[PDB]
Symmetry: C2
Subunit: 60 residues, 2 copies
Amino acid sequence: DDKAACADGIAAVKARVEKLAPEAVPQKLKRALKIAEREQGEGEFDECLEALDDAKRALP
Amino acid sequence: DDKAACADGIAAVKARVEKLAPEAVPQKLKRALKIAEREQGEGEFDECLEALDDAKRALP
Ligand SMILES: [La+3]
Protein backbone atom coordinates (compact mmCIF):
# COMPACT_ATOMS: atom_id res chain seq x y z
CA ASP A 1 0.00 0.00 0.00
CA ASP A 2 1.41 3.41 -0.98
CA LYS A 3 0.02 5.01 2.18
CA ALA A 4 1.78 2.44 4.37
CA ALA A 5 5.05 2.67 2.42
CA CYS A 6 4.98 6.46 2.59
CA ALA A 7 4.53 6.50 6.37
CA ASP A 8 7.14 3.79 6.88
CA GLY A 9 9.53 5.44 4.42
CA ILE A 10 9.34 8.78 6.22
CA ALA A 11 10.05 6.96 9.49
CA ALA A 12 13.04 5.15 8.00
CA VAL A 13 14.63 8.31 6.62
CA LYS A 14 14.16 10.20 9.89
CA ALA A 15 15.70 7.26 11.76
CA ARG A 16 18.72 7.42 9.47
CA VAL A 17 19.05 11.21 9.84
CA GLU A 18 18.68 11.25 13.64
CA LYS A 19 22.12 9.61 13.61
CA LEU A 20 23.64 12.57 11.74
CA ALA A 21 25.06 15.65 13.38
CA PRO A 22 22.24 18.24 13.13
CA GLU A 23 24.58 20.78 11.56
CA ALA A 24 25.60 18.15 8.95
CA VAL A 25 22.06 17.50 7.64
CA PRO A 26 21.90 18.95 4.10
CA GLN A 27 19.20 21.44 3.25
CA LYS A 28 18.04 19.45 0.23
CA LEU A 29 17.46 16.45 2.53
CA LYS A 30 15.17 18.51 4.78
CA ARG A 31 13.45 19.96 1.74
CA ALA A 32 12.78 16.51 0.26
CA LEU A 33 11.51 15.27 3.63
CA LYS A 34 9.07 18.18 3.84
CA ILE A 35 7.83 17.64 0.27
CA ALA A 36 7.18 13.99 1.11
CA GLU A 37 5.25 15.06 4.22
CA ARG A 38 3.29 17.66 2.24
CA GLU A 39 2.31 15.11 -0.40
CA GLN A 40 1.47 12.64 2.37
CA GLY A 41 -0.78 15.26 3.94
CA GLU A 42 -2.50 15.76 0.57
CA GLY A 43 -3.17 12.03 0.14
CA GLU A 44 -0.74 11.70 -2.79
CA PHE A 45 1.18 8.80 -1.30
CA ASP A 46 2.78 7.91 -4.63
CA GLU A 47 4.37 11.36 -4.82
CA CYS A 48 5.52 11.02 -1.19
CA LEU A 49 7.37 7.87 -2.25
CA GLU A 50 9.05 9.74 -5.10
CA ALA A 51 10.19 12.54 -2.77
CA LEU A 52 11.59 9.93 -0.37
CA ASP A 53 13.84 8.70 -3.19
CA ASP A 54 15.26 12.22 -3.47
CA ALA A 55 15.64 12.30 0.30
CA LYS A 56 17.56 9.01 0.20
CA ARG A 57 19.71 10.26 -2.69
CA ALA A 58 20.63 13.24 -0.48
CA LEU A 59 21.91 11.28 2.53
CA PRO A 60 25.71 11.54 3.09
CA ASP B 1 2.82 22.95 -22.29
CA ASP B 2 1.16 21.75 -19.07
CA LYS B 3 2.02 25.01 -17.29
CA ALA B 4 0.31 27.05 -20.02
CA ALA B 5 -2.73 24.75 -20.17
CA CYS B 6 -3.09 24.85 -16.39
CA ALA B 7 -3.07 28.65 -16.27
CA ASP B 8 -5.41 28.94 -19.24
CA GLY B 9 -7.67 26.20 -17.90
CA ILE B 10 -8.04 27.94 -14.54
CA ALA B 11 -8.91 31.15 -16.39
CA ALA B 12 -11.50 29.38 -18.53
CA VAL B 13 -13.27 27.77 -15.58
CA LYS B 14 -13.37 31.03 -13.62
CA ALA B 15 -14.78 32.78 -16.69
CA ARG B 16 -17.52 30.18 -16.88
CA VAL B 17 -18.30 30.43 -13.16
CA GLU B 18 -18.36 34.24 -13.04
CA LYS B 19 -21.58 33.88 -15.04
CA LEU B 20 -23.19 31.79 -12.29
CA ALA B 21 -25.11 33.20 -9.37
CA PRO B 22 -22.57 33.20 -6.49
CA GLU B 23 -25.00 31.34 -4.23
CA ALA B 24 -25.43 28.68 -6.98
CA VAL B 25 -21.71 27.78 -7.26
CA PRO B 26 -21.33 24.25 -5.83
CA GLN B 27 -18.83 23.64 -3.06
CA LYS B 28 -17.14 20.82 -4.94
CA LEU B 29 -16.50 23.22 -7.84
CA LYS B 30 -14.70 25.67 -5.52
CA ARG B 31 -12.83 22.80 -3.92
CA ALA B 32 -11.63 21.47 -7.29
CA LEU B 33 -10.61 24.99 -8.35
CA LYS B 34 -8.54 25.39 -5.19
CA ILE B 35 -6.86 21.99 -5.62
CA ALA B 36 -5.92 22.98 -9.17
CA GLU B 37 -4.47 26.26 -7.86
CA ARG B 38 -2.59 24.44 -5.08
CA GLU B 39 -1.05 21.98 -7.54
CA GLN B 40 -0.26 24.88 -9.87
CA GLY B 41 1.50 26.63 -7.00
CA GLU B 42 3.52 23.46 -6.35
CA GLY B 43 4.63 23.18 -9.99
CA GLU B 44 2.58 20.01 -10.61
CA PHE B 45 0.84 21.34 -13.69
CA ASP B 46 -0.28 17.88 -14.78
CA GLU B 47 -2.20 17.45 -11.53
CA CYS B 48 -3.70 20.93 -11.95
CA LEU B 49 -5.07 19.75 -15.31
CA GLU B 50 -6.62 16.69 -13.66
CA ALA B 51 -8.30 18.83 -10.98
CA LEU B 52 -9.67 21.11 -13.70
CA ASP B 53 -11.45 18.10 -15.20
CA ASP B 54 -13.20 17.59 -11.86
CA ALA B 55 -14.01 21.30 -11.78
CA LYS B 56 -15.53 21.06 -15.27
CA ARG B 57 -17.48 17.92 -14.28
CA ALA B 58 -18.94 19.96 -11.41
CA LEU B 59 -20.33 22.86 -13.47
CA PRO B 60 -24.17 22.99 -13.62
LA1 LIG C 1 0.72 17.72 -4.80
